[PDB]
Design a protein around this ligand. Structure first.
Ligand code: CL
Ligand code: CL
Ligand code: CL
Ligand code: CL
Ligand code: CL
Ligand code: NA
Lengths: 253, 251, 251, 256
């Protein structure tokens, strides 16, 4: 199943879509600057692009840690990103009441991995009618992703993206099961599957891991820069596009 | 560090406390009925008991599974349980705004494992000043509990219980690391540690018994059941009495 | 099923047997010194005791590294231990050809965890007719122990002990699944199950104590270990817990 | 670091080498027919090819399932394969005494993963001076491979290949950590790294896993087929076409 996001066709047999951006919104000017680098690089490379950022870091290690600009500022910054660049955007939501107002602005709304079993958040997200990015919890097997998809379907929203971010591997370490992509395709109605390489690394390896995941034939790549050094983005993406073009050119089977 | 909960002393050197009850509150009649059975068994063996139920469960098996009776009626039911049986109670909260009114009634407030990192909820819970049960995520190592504890401390509350529920072991399976209890005690200032055996298992009674006995062998403040019962508790109490009556290793 | 080893009765509803000694045999006199200590401690505590040692270090730090006394002298040393102390002994074997000569001297022959699938070693060990300790591989599920037991049974030996030594938990780490003990009993015909706490352990004295206590809480035939008076402090506590558990009827 | 195996160059920057064959040597004529198919397909696609089989499978499903033709007959069969097709061969050894006779015939000798820390076998293998394929144990981290390599180096052999076969993931299951390839390259002096996809499993799965691995820039791919977890022999060509496509792309771009 493909999903149209404005003029972008997102699908597991379509050219890969870059979901790219930053950890958290910090100011308008820094956001616009970073986003302009992404747009410029992806435009020239011919890669469909969706800008990513959180408006709030809800689970930092200290109650005093900087959390980003917050929701009201955040949606103001997103509105300007959309106006200036004409691209879709994606952000995460942490509380049910945030969903509809966030969804008025942000094209794709994201269910954080920790909150996949917050059933009222699922319901509130589904009710917006927006495209949804479901972050696969590190504690959830690829065959059980269907359980989350089921909930969204029962709540009336079938515009769902499945986002790999690694699986718990002993303590304080993650492993990406390259077979999980295919399991998710087979068991969740071939919904778009994307790969968050950035959060998968938590514990030069970013390129190798990204290439490996995209070799399994995926709708998109999800990443953050500062995270990849921003100036390496073009060279990084040249590689990814080379591999994606090759895989997508091969008949399935 | 011990925590007084009404007449109960909760601590890793104290007789173990049983936490148990029902999944979600339906009605006063239904609640008092189940609570009465736990109360009768625990009173028969002299085991301290805290009744558990959810008034509004956000982590449900299905979208339309009953969440519980809700805040207003749920707290009335809890008030009744406390009055009738003279026991403390425990309930989970998932909304920051719910922490304060819940804390007027519920002796212990529980932080769901999936929300254990959610700063706004932690702060809202801390600010109640109530005893808090921190459920350890299956994806967090025991040495990361100190960070959650630290956030409660920042927000002004040190009346904290750490609750083991298992750790992710490949796909689907949970394993309980018996060494994790000690790691939590050493890094978190010997706070009360309790063992959620029921959720550690995601026949079944025989499994639960072995696992409960193994955990309680490590010297724990409590045992947590979302869950015959007399036979089980006799065995737990026997082991717990033996263990707690011996001094900790000499240094 | 119980196994008689001289006058020791080994089984899951009998008083636990200690399997203890040293990593690798180095010299007769240090061997006799160490064995003397275990014998003295276990005797005065009333615990049956089997002395353990390897005649060879199969995985060595360097290709030049020590290695141990080797089979020839190793068996000399075991002969003297048995003569001096009148106790049974246990050693591991790594090559099928070693099995019959080692079994002439050593009461229990041990299948190393990493060789548990070496079918020729399995067969060679079974052919000796000796008591066999099967070390559970750290990759193998407890239910799959029945496959190794089956091979020993087809090869004509049912005098088998199953030995827990932890399961792989991410990289460079082990966890002991306390539910595995019961699975092995249920699926392998209640053969004796013992717990290698030493190798399960990927301050640390209290870790080993907690872990041993948790395992022995599941009702086991024995404990396998290596070593101010820490052995007796440890064993006093293990014995007290084992005595309790073995006095309760099986549920 | 590259290794020359007859006229094949094996290395992490070279066109991938296929290490392909069967589980257990059972026979002469069937072995030759299977090998002939591997040869025909690999020659058609221009892919360097090394035939694989065990003559003595020590890890068996039952105590009396056939171990294989054994040392002397196995080596005779390998000699015939080499004579008939002009290709190198690879086999495994489980005992120090087997090392010399096997190394005299076989172009690569393989250290079984479960034996990879057995110092006596490591030394006996090293001292052959033969090219060695070291299977990474499923219970061993990628950063620990340098310790096996060190032991080979101490015994005088540096012609070493490191072979991924997955890591233990919960019970009775494996996952392939795609980051481990790079860890092994960086910590083990960029020795050739190869990927045993067959034993990493437990197929469209085989193809996905193989492509993911080869995307990380590897010296070779290790697999088994069945003449009628092993790939169907008649689908070999389609499979290798897809692998070759990705390998040729990756290898044609400079490392970033
Ligand atoms: Cl994110
Ligand atoms: Cl997660
Ligand atoms: Cl959890
Ligand atoms: Cl092989
Ligand atoms: Cl292995
Ligand atoms: Na050779």
């Amino acid at each position: 199943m493909d999903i149209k996001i404005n003029d972008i066709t997102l699908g597991n047999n379509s050219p890969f879509v870059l979901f790219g951006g930053i950890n958290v919104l910090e100011s308008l000017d820094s956001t616009l600057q970073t986003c302009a680098h992404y747009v410029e690089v992806t435009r020239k490379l011919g890669i469909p692009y969706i800008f990513k950022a959180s408006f709030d870091k809800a689970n930092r290690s200290s109650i005093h840690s900087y959390r980003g600009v917050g929701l009201e500022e955040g949606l103001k910054i997103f509105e300007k990103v959309k106006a200036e660049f004409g691209i879709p955007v994606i952000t995460d939501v942490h509380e049910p009441h945030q969903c509809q107002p966030v969804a008025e602005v942000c094209d794709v709304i994201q269910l954080p991995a920790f909150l996949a079993r917050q059933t009222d958040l699922v319901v509130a997200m589904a009710k917006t009618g927006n495209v949804v990015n479901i972050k696969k919890p590190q504690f959830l097997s690829p065959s059980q992703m269907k359980n989350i998809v089921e909930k969204f379907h029962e709540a009336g929203n079938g515009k769902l993206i499945l986002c790999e971010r690694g699986s718990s591997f002993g303590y304080d370490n993650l492993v990406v099961d390259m077979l999980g992509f295919g399991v998710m395709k087979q068991t969740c109605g071939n919904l778009p599957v994307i790969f968050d390489v950035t959060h998968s690394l938590q514990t030069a390896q970013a390129l190798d891991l990204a290439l490996a995941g995209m070799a399994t034939r995926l709708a998109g790549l999800f990443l953050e820069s500062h995270a990849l050094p921003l100036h390496l983005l073009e060279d990084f993406l040249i590689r990814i596009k080379a591999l994606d073009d090759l895989i997508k050119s091969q008949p399935i089977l």
